[PDB]
Amino acid sequence: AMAVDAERLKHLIVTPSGAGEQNMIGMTPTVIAVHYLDETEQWEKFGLEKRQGALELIKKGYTQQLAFRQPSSAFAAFVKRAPSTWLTAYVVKVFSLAVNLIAIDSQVLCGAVKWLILEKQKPDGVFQEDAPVIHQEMIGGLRNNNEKDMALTAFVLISLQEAKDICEEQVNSLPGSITKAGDFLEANYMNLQRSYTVAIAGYALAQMGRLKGPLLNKFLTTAKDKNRWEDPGKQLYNVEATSYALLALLQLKDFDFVPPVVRWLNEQRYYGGGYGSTQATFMVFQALAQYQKDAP
Amino acid sequence: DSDIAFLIDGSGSIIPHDFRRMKEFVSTVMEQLKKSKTLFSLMQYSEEFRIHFTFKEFQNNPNPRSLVKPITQLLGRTHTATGIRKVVRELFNITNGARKNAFKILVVITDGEKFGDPLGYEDVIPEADREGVIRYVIGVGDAFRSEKSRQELNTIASKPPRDHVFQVNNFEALKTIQN
Ligand code: NI
Ligand code: NI
């Protein structure tokens, strides 16, 4: 397929400002904007002088987010507020994708990973949130989900895998935690009912090579008309879920299921931005960029 | 004095544009070749299988553009081998309209990329030879782009492969095989 016109992505250049959560909301679209334009290579029809004008904004959001880094290398909205399991895992997720953009201090990234594993992982692999984020609209379809330990564990695990190579040396309990998280997902994947959880956990399993057999059939047949993973309401959740599926399909090298999924995503005409658009904006452009990188 | 079957790819790797080409190519072959008493049958495949018209159902309805118009795409994976086995065992059965002592022709229209198929080509080809099934292959999209794709088209087609493998957009695909 053809890459998205960069002229429709101008509104994603957002100046980051706010608390430990407010800053990441504004940081997210900027980071994923240049990441997409890097792969698709549209800096010529958009102006290379603007690249540095956005690259330094990412640096700004990074340094401003460091002020909310707690002594346990965890992250919360406030320096006094109890650290969030999701927010910390989201900081790792965004920073891992921006390691080739700006200078990301490895001690910050690995410290957060070590905290998630040591203090926030149940012995059965489950990651638990003990201090939810204030802005509940920045967590996408994880908001008001019946399922559960599964959805959160899948989310955190995806972050750990995106930072596995860069923090394998410092944190040795990382491959063990990854396996444990994957064991819980695989053991309860067939019992999933919501398409969102099927999509996000399916991607987590696919990154391991543990999305096979009945788990795969469950994943593929959950797709409405073989082109999207749809839950009744909140379109933004369905875009986010389909993006996770696309990433899972690209991991499986399944180029029979990729084109109709990509085709559907492009016919939604979603370019991110707005209230509660953080996850969808981050997902729909991480997936489409991965598609551009992998498409023959 | 010839039975012609169509095995068309309906997997998601086939873009809707290339599927129209498939859907229009068949209409041309059926119209520019009647030319009775040639019989036609068509089955679309993906990860599932659907017979749109048998040799009997075509003998009752002569209009070519009518039998192919409501045909849609399956959008599954790509099970080429299983599709070939299903054609020779079912579509070429007398109970479906296959006539005795008539030429069996299979027209496989695929992009040359089988995927997710439990069956291999080495499990359906030696069976297609002992039944005497003429195999023509019509590559679509980027079926001639790669090396594994072009050798797959030659694998499906019989020998020699230089007389069986053609590109879909060719309007001279029928005038070259009649002689
Ligand atoms: Ni292309
Ligand atoms: Ni295909």
Curated annotation (Swiss-Prot), chain A:
Changing residue 162 to A: Impaired binding of C3d to CR2. It comes from the Eukaryota. There is a cross-link at residues 19-22 (Isoglutamyl cysteine thioester (Cys-Gln)). Changing residue 39 to A: Impaired binding of C3d to CR2. Disulfide bonds join 110-167. Changing residue 172 to R: Impaired binding of C3d to CR2. Coiled coil: none annotated. Interacts with CFH. Interacts with CR2. This is Complement C3d fragment. The gene is C3. The chain holds residues 994 to 1287 of 1663 of the full protein.
From Swiss-Prot, chain B:
Glycans are attached at residue 93. It comes from the Eukaryota. It is found in: Cell membrane; Membrane raft. Residues 3-179 form the VWFA domain. Predominantly expressed in monocytes and granulocytes. Expressed in neutrophils (at protein level). Coiled coil: none annotated. It is linked to Systemic lupus erythematosus 6: A chronic, relapsing, inflammatory, and often febrile multisystemic disorder of connective tissue, characterized principally by involvement of the skin, joints, kidneys and serosal membranes. It is of unknown etiology, but is thought to represent a failure of the regulatory mechanisms of the autoimmune system. The disease is marked by a wide range of system dysfunctions, an elevated erythrocyte sedimentation rate, and the formation of LE cells in the blood or bone marrow. Heterodimer of an alpha and a beta subunit. ITGAM associates with ITGB2. Found in a complex with CD177 and ITGB2/CD18. Interacts with JAM3. Interacts with THBD. Interacts with complement factor H/CFH; this interaction mediates adhesion of neutrophils to pathogens leading to pathogen clearance. Interacts with TMEM268; this interaction inhibits ITGAM degradation via the endosome-lysosome pathway. The integrin I-domain (insert) is a VWFA domain. Integrins with I-domains do not undergo protease cleavage. Integrin ITGAM/ITGB2 is implicated in various adhesive interactions of monocytes, macrophages and granulocytes as well as in mediating the uptake of complement-coated particles and pathogens. It is identical with CR-3, the receptor for the iC3b fragment of the third complement component. It probably recognizes the R-G-D peptide in C3b. Integrin ITGAM/ITGB2 is also a receptor for fibrinogen, factor X and ICAM1. It recognizes P1 and P2 peptides of fibrinogen gamma chain. Regulates neutrophil migration. Belongs to the integrin alpha chain family. This is Integrin alpha-M. It comes from Homo sapiens (Human). The chain holds residues 148 to 326 of 1152 of the full protein.
